[PDB]
Amino acid sequence: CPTDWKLFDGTCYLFNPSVLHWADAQESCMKEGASLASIHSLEQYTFVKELTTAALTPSWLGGGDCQVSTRWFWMDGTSMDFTDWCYAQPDTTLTECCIQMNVGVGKCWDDTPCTHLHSSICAKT
Template structure:
């Protein structure tokens, strides 16, 4: 399986099915001081860019190993924050993995 260089952290700059992408992880944090070193805080969540190529499942597993999940966005402001975070880390707007769920398995 080929892996493509992409960022998995946070935001769906593009959605699609890739063999690989970089990863971005998020975790909840009441204050900026609660974020681990190297993570960025925005609206009670910490984000980090992970520059390793991996599948979506591997990216989520990597985030879980850091007690976090793939990033997701819930507002235009959060989308822009994530997009800028990726740009600062890579120097460009690159494709990213984001968190999600299997609608066939999840019922509300």
């Protein structure tokens, strides 16, 4: 993996602390040959959480249900097979359709307006 990137089971991950809307965050990962990350297991989730500072900063992931409500997709060609919704999630209204992790005291996932500004996780093989 490149400098600042961290390796787990064959994928390289980077925390981007700069707050960006989801599209700016995706484009920033793409400039580094990456995508906003997907998550497929509790251990992948734990590894990614460990990159988000001691504060476990709220961060964009590369998922959403922005095309058809209740149909979630990742940007990396993987399927939505693991979720960690917070209590009272997911909101399926299209107005909040992007996946944000590290939300609240329980550090879990929300569907959030994509135009909100957050840090983000990039991943590339």
